[PDB]
Each structure stands twice: as C-alpha cells, then as structure tokens.
Amino acid sequence: MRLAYVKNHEIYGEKLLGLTLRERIEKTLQRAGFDVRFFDELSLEEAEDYLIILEPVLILERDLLLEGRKILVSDGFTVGYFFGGDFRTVFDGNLQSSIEKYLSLNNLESYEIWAIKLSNDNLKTAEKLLLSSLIYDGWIAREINRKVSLRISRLLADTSVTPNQITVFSFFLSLVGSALFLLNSYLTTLLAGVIIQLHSIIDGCDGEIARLKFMESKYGAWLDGVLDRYSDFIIVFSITYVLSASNPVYWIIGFLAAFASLMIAYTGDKFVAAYMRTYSPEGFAIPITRDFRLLIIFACSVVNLPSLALVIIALLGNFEALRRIVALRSYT
Amino acid sequence: MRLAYVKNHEIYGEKLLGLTLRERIEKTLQRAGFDVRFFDELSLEEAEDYLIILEPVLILERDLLLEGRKILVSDGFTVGYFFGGDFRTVFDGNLQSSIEKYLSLNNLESYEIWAIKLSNDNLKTAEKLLLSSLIKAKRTGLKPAYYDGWIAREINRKVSLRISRLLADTSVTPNQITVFSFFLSLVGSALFLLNSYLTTLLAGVIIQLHSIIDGCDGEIARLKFMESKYGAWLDGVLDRYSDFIIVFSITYVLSASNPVYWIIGFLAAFASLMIAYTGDKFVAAYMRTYSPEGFAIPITRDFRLLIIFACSVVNLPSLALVIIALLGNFEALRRIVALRS
Ligand SMILES: Nc1ccn([C@@H]2O[C@H](COP(=O)(O)OP(=O)(O)OC[C@@H](O)CO)[C@@H](O)[C@H]2O)c(=O)n1
Ligand SMILES: Nc1ccn([C@@H]2O[C@H](COP(=O)(O)OP(=O)(O)OC[C@@H](O)CO)[C@@H](O)[C@H]2O)c(=O)n1
Ligand SMILES: [Ca+2]
Ligand SMILES: [Ca+2]
Ligand SMILES: [Ca+2]
Ligand SMILES: [Ca+2]
C-alpha cells in the first residue's frame, strides 16, 4: 500500500474540462497505485511508500511510474516528494521541518514528470496542456484531425456524454456517409466524402473523452476498433456497389480495398496480441492507416472519383500489408 | 534467481519426438523461470526457492506456476518437491536426510501437476500423452489466443497430431509448415477457379486438409519449444489471407451465373475476418484468452472450412457462402452485444 499526501488548496475546487482539479489529481494518483489523502495538517499513516505534494499541480503524464526514492520536478520546479517508508522514522508532526530534516540526511535524485503548477492565471494554459495530453496517430490524424477533434471534445467535456456513446454515434455517421454513397450522384458523393472525413475526425473524440474524463474501459477499446472495422467495410461496400452498375470489374477492386482496410487493422492489432506492445514501425511504412484511408476517400469523392479511392486503398493497402509481413520477420 | 535441482537418470538420454527427455524437462523448467542444475550428489547454492526432482519424469503441463512451498503430485504420485529458501537452514549435505527433516518441520500442501513418471516401458505411453498435450485446450494449461473448436478438437487434431508425430523427427520448422498450410489454401482456391465438380470436390478436400495441417505448425512449435511471437502473428495473418482468398475464388466463379453472389461473397468474406478480429481485439484489450462462457454460434475457422468442405462435395459452394455469411455475421453481432457485460 502506498499513500499520497496532497495538501488542500482552494484552487483544487475549480473544475477543468468536466472534473474538479481535485478529482483529477485524485484519479491520476490512484491510476499510479496510490491511496490518496488530502490534508491541511499532516498526520502520518503506515504504508510502504509516501508521496508528498505541497503545491497545487495538474499532472499531465499518463503512465506515471515511481520506483525508488526520487524528487518530482517540472521544468526545474519541484512538484512533490517521493519518500520511502523509512520517512516514518523521521516525521515529527510538523511537516516542513520534518521534510527539511529528512532532506538534509538524504541526497535525493531528481525525476522529471509532465505537470503544470496551478495558479489563478494559468488555468487556460492548463486546459490547452491537458487537452494536448490526450493525443500512435498517423500524420493526417495528428496534424489535421486532432486539431478539430480536440476542439470538439473540449465542448463535449462539459456534458454527460460517455466515450461509448461517441463511438456508436461516430459509427452512425459512417453509415450516413455510406447511405449518401448509395444515392449515386455527385452532390451526394460529395456529401458522403465530407461526412466520412468528419467521421474520421470524430472517431478521435471517443478516445479523447475517455482519457480526459478517466472513462477508459476494456470494452470501450474493443468496440472502438470493431465498429471501425464495420465502418471501413460498409463504406467500401457501398462505393463498390454503385460502381458495379457501370463496371463489374470494380467488385474485384472493391474486394481488395475492403480486405486491405481490414488487414492494415488486423496486422496491427494482431501484433499487439502477439508481442504485447504498441505497434509502431521504426522507419519507412506506406501511409495507408485509417486517417489516410478516409482522407483519400474524402478527396476522391469531392472530384466525383470514389473509384480512384478504391484503387489507391487496394494498392497501397495490400502492398503495405505485404510489407509488414516481410518486415516483421526481422526483429522478433 | 530460482534453482531447479533434477537428479540424473539414464532415461533422460533417450529421445522423445525430436528432443531428449533431458532437453524437454530442462526447457519446461526454464520456461517456468528456473535455473536448472542436473546432479548426482547435491551441493546447494543460494536462491529464493528450490525445486527438487528425484524420480525421472516428463512434465506435460505447459504453463506451470509454483507459488508457495508445495509438493508436486501427479495422480497420487510425488513428482517433485517445491521448497522455500529456508531449506538452506535445514540442508545438512545429505539430500535424503534433509528432505525428511524439512518435511518434518513443515506441512506442505499437495499440488497436482500433469506429468508422467518415466520408465523404459511406458515411453510409448509418454509419447501419446505428450502429443495430446499439444492441443489448444484448458487441460494442457496453455493460455493461447483461442482454444480449439469442437471440429478441430474432435476431428482435426486426431489427424494433425499423427502428422506432427512424423514431422518431429525432421528439421521442419513451425514457420515452414505455416507457409505450406497457406500454400495449400492457394491450391484449394485455384481448384475452385477451374469451375467443375471434380475440381470443386478436390478444392473442398484440400481446404479441409488445409484446416487439419493448420494445426501442425502450432503442434510442432509447442512440441519442440520453437514458439515465437512472429510465428503466432504469421499463423493468424495467413489464415485471414486464406479465408479471404477461398471465399474470393468461390465468389468469382459464382458471379458468372448470378451477380448477386458478389454480395453474399462479400458478407461471407467479411464475417470470416470479423470472427477473427473480434477475438484478437479482445486479446489486445483484455490481455487474456478469448473464451465465450455460454452460447456461441459454431462458426469458428474449423467449422467454416468444414462447412466449405461439406458444401463442396455436394457441388454447392454457394451454400457455404450463405452459411458462413449468415452464421458469421450474427455471431459477430452477438459478440458485440455479449461483451457489453
Ligand atoms: N469508447 C471508447 C473509445 C476509446 N477508448 C480508449 O481510447 C483509445 C483510442 O483512442 P482514439 O483517440 O479513439 O484512437 P483511434 O480512434 O483508434 O484513432 C483516431 C485518430 O487516429 C483520429 O482519427 C482506445 O484504446 C480505448 O482504450 C475507450 O476507452 N472508450
Ligand atoms: N509458425 C508458428 C505458428 C504457430 N506458432 C504458435 O502456435 C500457436 C497456434 O497453434 P495452432 O495449433 O496452430 O492453432 P490454430 O492455427 O488455431 O489451429 C487450429 C486448427 O485446428 C485449424 O482449424 C500460435 O499462437 C503460436 O504461439 C508458432 O510458434 N510458430
Ligand atoms: Ca476511436
Ligand atoms: Ca472507432
Ligand atoms: Ca496454425
Ligand atoms: Ca495459419
């Protein structure tokens, strides 16, 4: 058992993006495996480890790990103290003095963590930093979609909307786009592409809201990916069906595109299942991840050429999948 | 560091399915996280825990876990002793005497493990048992991505194990079998394209042959401790390619008669991937073996390929597409609904 002692401050009562800052630091520290104790005057309980936080701070780091006695720092500024259980043998009922004496008999190493010290002025700075802490994204995802999706999640933060609700809703948008494709006209094809790209953007909000409001879940991760598999398939299927009326050859291209869209996903998730680490190719890889796939569909749709999108997704998709098969034979 | 002390026996020099019983017990224990020391007379080194095996034994269990001092037992017979580090404070240079005293000062719980005590007579029995331990089941203690379906377990494994027994004496690697299994699916797919009952019959037969042999790569991997991360990755990926290409070939031929079969083909092809994806995504998210508790539609790969096989011999591959599309998609949707809880 580890205890995190956090001194109360009036600023902790302010809400930032759906939760009070008090709940945020409480939940963040609990994630790290610490029992949290807020205090004005400190009374020490027995525990294996102790975390002491005197100044009000917003922790932005996501996978905090504290093994071994250290001092927590953010840009030269001390955030908190991480002491061992032997701190019990020095504590005398007065906090600063006990810390002072304890620090004098020690020579503690510093440890950098992502956090921002809170003031009544920099709360806007804290929000932007907290939002930026929510973003394995492809280049299109990171540099385009996130810019919009974060602005949306910011607004969704103030609501009771759950990550799962966003996921299903995002899925529904992909259906609207697919439906618009079935109407077989440039206008509807254009509207289709726009909503597909919107779907691409909003599919980041489910994850953003999940991390922002500490509502991540195993089922959430599962459903998020699965419905993306359904969306990719249904989108490609819709585009192929309309095109098949003109040329039956598009069935073949359609098949190859749908398969590729699924395999880029499968190969990645299967890697995680087998290696138990995040998939991330070190060097060159053909940019045909989902953010690219939907942007390609969007772009080709605005010029009334969804068929060209299938060709690219089929080609770049299948080749990248094959590239991954050959590449992964290496380090394993 | 944890030390496993194994008393030497002449029988450990004998080869069982490609590896000596020495190599087998050594690797099994190494997998279990023990530094292994073979001995005639025992000199004790320091470690957190000690495992002592006096009688010659073949361990069949796959994911052995030893927490807390215990006595290891197989069907009433003592296999070995699992002592704590405090055994050092009792050891007097004589193994037999120290075991007696340590057991005297303690009250060890018995602990059942799957293993067979080895004799010069029961080696054929050891072989049969070792082969049966290669199956993806809960009885073996393996915690894989999936367990074997009913068709795989009750039909396919019976053949693939008999094949794996023969492959054990060769230099054939798991990856080589995986590629070969995939190539068979291509031969099956090609036969579908020739569009005749004879070739259609051969296609189905080879698809089921493919289904059976797709168990050999996994069997040989576990049998000779040649499991690998890429191996697990490749085994699954090529199965997806196979599922897609098989359905693709059948759909392409059928489309010449009625273009609507493209749709059924699509739905069948999609399902074949989703049954796989939903499971592996579970593994990725929950980090444990996927296993539905109650009702689930039997449309796993062993069934799908058997369905394709059966439908092909009656010259109705379209029916296989219909069955796979229907059973497959409802099962995928069922998994979406079931996992919410
Ligand atoms: N309803 C949800 C959705 C997501 N997550 C969590 O958020 C992670 C994914 O976050 P995303 O931002 O949605 O990432 P992704 O949608 O895969 O990519 C979208 C992004 O590239 C922009 O298009 C999942 O692993 C899951 O743990 C969750 O818990 N519940
Ligand atoms: N070249 C390979 C292939 C597989 N494996 C390992 O074997 C496991 C799968 O074993 P299989 O028995 O082959 O499982 P499966 O392919 O599902 O066989 C099912 C079969 O009955 C077909 O219906 C993989 O996860 C991997 O750990 C390996 O190490 N190397
Ligand atoms: Ca998402
Ligand atoms: Ca999604
Ligand atoms: Ca296999
Ligand atoms: Ca395979």
Short mmCIF file of N, CA and C in Angstrom, two decimals, chain A residues 218-219 221-223 225-226 229-230 233 237 251 254-255 258-259 262-263 266-267 269-275 321-322 324-325 328-329 332, chain B residues 229-230 232-234 236-237 240-241 244 248 262-263 265-266 269-270 273-274 277-278 280-286 332-333 335-336 339-340:
data_model
loop_
_atom_site.label_atom_id
_atom_site.label_comp_id
_atom_site.label_asym_id
_atom_site.label_seq_id
_atom_site.Cartn_x
_atom_site.Cartn_y
_atom_site.Cartn_z
N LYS A 218 -11.96 -1.51 -21.07
CA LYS A 218 -11.54 -2.57 -21.98
C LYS A 218 -12.56 -2.77 -23.10
N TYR A 219 -13.84 -2.77 -22.75
CA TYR A 219 -14.89 -2.88 -23.77
C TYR A 219 -14.89 -1.68 -24.71
N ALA A 221 -12.31 0.06 -25.72
CA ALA A 221 -11.24 -0.15 -26.69
C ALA A 221 -11.66 -1.17 -27.74
N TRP A 222 -12.31 -2.24 -27.29
CA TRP A 222 -12.77 -3.30 -28.17
C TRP A 222 -13.79 -2.81 -29.18
N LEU A 223 -14.82 -2.13 -28.69
CA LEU A 223 -15.89 -1.63 -29.54
C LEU A 223 -15.40 -0.56 -30.52
N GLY A 225 -12.54 -0.23 -32.02
CA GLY A 225 -11.88 -0.86 -33.15
C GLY A 225 -12.82 -1.66 -34.03
N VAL A 226 -13.67 -2.46 -33.40
CA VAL A 226 -14.60 -3.32 -34.13
C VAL A 226 -15.55 -2.51 -35.03
N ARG A 229 -13.98 -1.39 -37.99
CA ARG A 229 -13.88 -2.46 -38.98
C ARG A 229 -15.16 -2.52 -39.80
N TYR A 230 -16.30 -2.40 -39.12
CA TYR A 230 -17.60 -2.35 -39.78
C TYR A 230 -17.74 -1.13 -40.67
N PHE A 233 -15.58 -1.46 -43.86
CA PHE A 233 -16.19 -2.44 -44.75
C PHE A 233 -17.44 -1.89 -45.43
N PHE A 237 -17.94 -1.13 -49.30
CA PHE A 237 -19.01 -1.93 -49.88
C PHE A 237 -20.00 -1.05 -50.62
N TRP A 251 -15.97 -4.81 -58.52
CA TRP A 251 -16.13 -5.80 -57.46
C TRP A 251 -14.77 -6.29 -56.99
N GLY A 254 -13.01 -3.50 -55.33
CA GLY A 254 -13.75 -3.32 -54.10
C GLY A 254 -13.35 -4.32 -53.04
N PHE A 255 -13.34 -5.60 -53.42
CA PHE A 255 -12.88 -6.68 -52.55
C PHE A 255 -11.50 -6.41 -51.99
N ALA A 258 -11.46 -3.44 -49.46
CA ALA A 258 -12.09 -3.81 -48.20
C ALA A 258 -11.16 -4.71 -47.40
N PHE A 259 -10.63 -5.72 -48.08
CA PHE A 259 -9.67 -6.63 -47.47
C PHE A 259 -8.47 -5.88 -46.89
N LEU A 262 -9.16 -3.86 -43.80
CA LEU A 262 -9.27 -4.75 -42.65
C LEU A 262 -7.91 -5.27 -42.22
N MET A 263 -7.05 -5.58 -43.19
CA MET A 263 -5.76 -6.19 -42.87
C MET A 263 -4.78 -5.22 -42.23
N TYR A 266 -5.99 -5.45 -38.85
CA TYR A 266 -5.76 -6.75 -38.24
C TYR A 266 -4.29 -6.97 -37.92
N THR A 267 -3.43 -6.70 -38.89
CA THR A 267 -1.99 -6.87 -38.72
C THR A 267 -1.45 -6.07 -37.54
N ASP A 269 -3.33 -4.96 -34.80
CA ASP A 269 -3.91 -5.46 -33.56
C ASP A 269 -3.37 -6.85 -33.21
N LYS A 270 -3.11 -7.66 -34.24
CA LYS A 270 -2.54 -8.99 -34.04
C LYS A 270 -1.12 -8.89 -33.48
N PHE A 271 -0.39 -7.86 -33.91
CA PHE A 271 0.94 -7.59 -33.39
C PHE A 271 0.89 -7.35 -31.89
N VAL A 272 -0.05 -6.52 -31.47
CA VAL A 272 -0.26 -6.22 -30.06
C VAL A 272 -0.62 -7.48 -29.28
N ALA A 273 -1.40 -8.36 -29.90
CA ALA A 273 -1.81 -9.59 -29.24
C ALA A 273 -0.62 -10.54 -29.06
N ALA A 274 0.30 -10.51 -30.01
CA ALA A 274 1.40 -11.47 -30.03
C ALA A 274 2.65 -10.96 -29.32
N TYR A 275 2.90 -9.66 -29.42
CA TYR A 275 4.12 -9.07 -28.86
C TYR A 275 3.84 -8.32 -27.56
N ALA A 321 0.47 -4.10 -46.26
CA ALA A 321 0.20 -5.32 -45.52
C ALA A 321 1.28 -6.36 -45.81
N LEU A 322 1.59 -6.54 -47.09
CA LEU A 322 2.66 -7.44 -47.51
C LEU A 322 4.02 -6.97 -46.98
N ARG A 324 4.57 -5.39 -44.26
CA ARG A 324 4.60 -5.69 -42.84
C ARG A 324 4.93 -7.16 -42.59
N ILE A 325 4.40 -8.04 -43.43
CA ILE A 325 4.69 -9.46 -43.34
C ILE A 325 6.19 -9.73 -43.49
N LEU A 328 8.43 -7.81 -40.47
CA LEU A 328 8.31 -8.31 -39.10
C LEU A 328 9.11 -9.59 -38.87
N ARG A 329 9.50 -10.25 -39.95
CA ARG A 329 10.35 -11.43 -39.88
C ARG A 329 11.68 -11.10 -39.20
N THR A 332 12.32 -10.16 -33.71
CA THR A 332 11.25 -10.84 -33.00
C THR A 332 11.81 -11.78 -31.94
N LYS B 229 6.94 -15.14 -31.32
CA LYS B 229 5.95 -14.08 -31.47
C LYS B 229 5.53 -13.88 -32.93
N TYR B 230 6.51 -13.89 -33.82
CA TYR B 230 6.25 -13.78 -35.25
C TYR B 230 5.48 -14.99 -35.76
N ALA B 232 3.24 -16.82 -34.09
CA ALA B 232 1.85 -16.63 -33.71
C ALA B 232 1.21 -15.58 -34.62
N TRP B 233 1.95 -14.52 -34.90
CA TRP B 233 1.50 -13.44 -35.77
C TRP B 233 1.22 -13.96 -37.19
N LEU B 234 2.21 -14.64 -37.77
CA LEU B 234 2.11 -15.14 -39.13
C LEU B 234 1.03 -16.21 -39.29
N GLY B 236 -1.78 -16.56 -37.81
CA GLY B 236 -3.08 -15.91 -37.87
C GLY B 236 -3.30 -15.09 -39.13
N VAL B 237 -2.30 -14.30 -39.50
CA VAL B 237 -2.39 -13.43 -40.67
C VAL B 237 -2.64 -14.22 -41.96
N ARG B 240 -6.12 -15.39 -42.39
CA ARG B 240 -7.01 -14.34 -42.87
C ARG B 240 -6.92 -14.21 -44.39
N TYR B 241 -5.70 -14.27 -44.90
CA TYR B 241 -5.47 -14.25 -46.34
C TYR B 241 -6.16 -15.46 -46.97
N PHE B 244 -10.01 -15.09 -46.93
CA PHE B 244 -10.40 -14.11 -47.94
C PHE B 244 -10.29 -14.67 -49.35
N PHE B 248 -13.11 -15.55 -51.98
CA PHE B 248 -12.95 -14.75 -53.19
C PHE B 248 -13.04 -15.60 -54.45
N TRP B 262 -21.89 -11.86 -55.51
CA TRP B 262 -20.86 -10.93 -55.05
C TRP B 262 -21.18 -10.45 -53.64
N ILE B 263 -22.44 -10.08 -53.43
CA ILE B 263 -22.91 -9.58 -52.14
C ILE B 263 -22.77 -10.64 -51.04
N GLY B 265 -20.87 -13.24 -51.16
CA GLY B 265 -19.43 -13.44 -51.05
C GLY B 265 -18.79 -12.43 -50.13
N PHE B 266 -19.10 -11.16 -50.38
CA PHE B 266 -18.66 -10.05 -49.54
C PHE B 266 -19.00 -10.29 -48.08
N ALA B 269 -16.98 -13.24 -46.72
CA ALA B 269 -15.58 -12.86 -46.59
C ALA B 269 -15.37 -11.97 -45.38
N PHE B 270 -16.22 -10.96 -45.24
CA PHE B 270 -16.21 -10.05 -44.10
C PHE B 270 -16.34 -10.79 -42.77
N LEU B 273 -13.30 -12.74 -41.51
CA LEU B 273 -12.30 -11.87 -40.90
C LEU B 273 -12.73 -11.37 -39.52
N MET B 274 -14.02 -11.06 -39.38
CA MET B 274 -14.53 -10.46 -38.15
C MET B 274 -14.57 -11.44 -36.98
N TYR B 277 -11.12 -11.06 -36.01
CA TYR B 277 -10.76 -9.74 -35.48
C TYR B 277 -11.33 -9.51 -34.08
N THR B 278 -12.62 -9.78 -33.91
CA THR B 278 -13.28 -9.57 -32.62
C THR B 278 -12.58 -10.33 -31.49
N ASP B 280 -9.22 -11.45 -31.51
CA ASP B 280 -7.87 -10.94 -31.31
C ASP B 280 -7.90 -9.55 -30.69
N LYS B 281 -8.91 -8.76 -31.05
CA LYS B 281 -9.08 -7.44 -30.46
C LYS B 281 -9.38 -7.57 -28.97
N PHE B 282 -10.12 -8.62 -28.61
CA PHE B 282 -10.38 -8.94 -27.21
C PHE B 282 -9.07 -9.22 -26.49
N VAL B 283 -8.23 -10.04 -27.13
CA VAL B 283 -6.92 -10.39 -26.59
C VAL B 283 -6.08 -9.13 -26.40
N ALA B 284 -6.20 -8.21 -27.34
CA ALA B 284 -5.46 -6.96 -27.29
C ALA B 284 -5.96 -6.05 -26.16
N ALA B 285 -7.26 -6.12 -25.88
CA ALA B 285 -7.88 -5.19 -24.94
C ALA B 285 -7.95 -5.74 -23.52
N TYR B 286 -8.16 -7.05 -23.40
CA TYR B 286 -8.36 -7.67 -22.09
C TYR B 286 -7.09 -8.40 -21.66
N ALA B 332 -20.81 -12.39 -35.03
CA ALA B 332 -20.06 -11.17 -34.82
C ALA B 332 -20.89 -10.16 -34.04
N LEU B 333 -22.13 -9.96 -34.48
CA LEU B 333 -23.06 -9.06 -33.80
C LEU B 333 -23.35 -9.53 -32.38
N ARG B 335 -21.34 -11.12 -30.45
CA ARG B 335 -20.16 -10.81 -29.66
C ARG B 335 -20.15 -9.34 -29.25
N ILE B 336 -20.59 -8.47 -30.14
CA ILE B 336 -20.72 -7.05 -29.82
C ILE B 336 -21.68 -6.86 -28.65
N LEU B 339 -20.35 -8.81 -25.08
CA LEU B 339 -19.19 -8.24 -24.40
C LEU B 339 -19.48 -6.94 -23.65
N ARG B 340 -20.62 -6.32 -23.92
CA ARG B 340 -21.03 -5.12 -23.19
C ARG B 340 -21.10 -5.40 -21.69
#
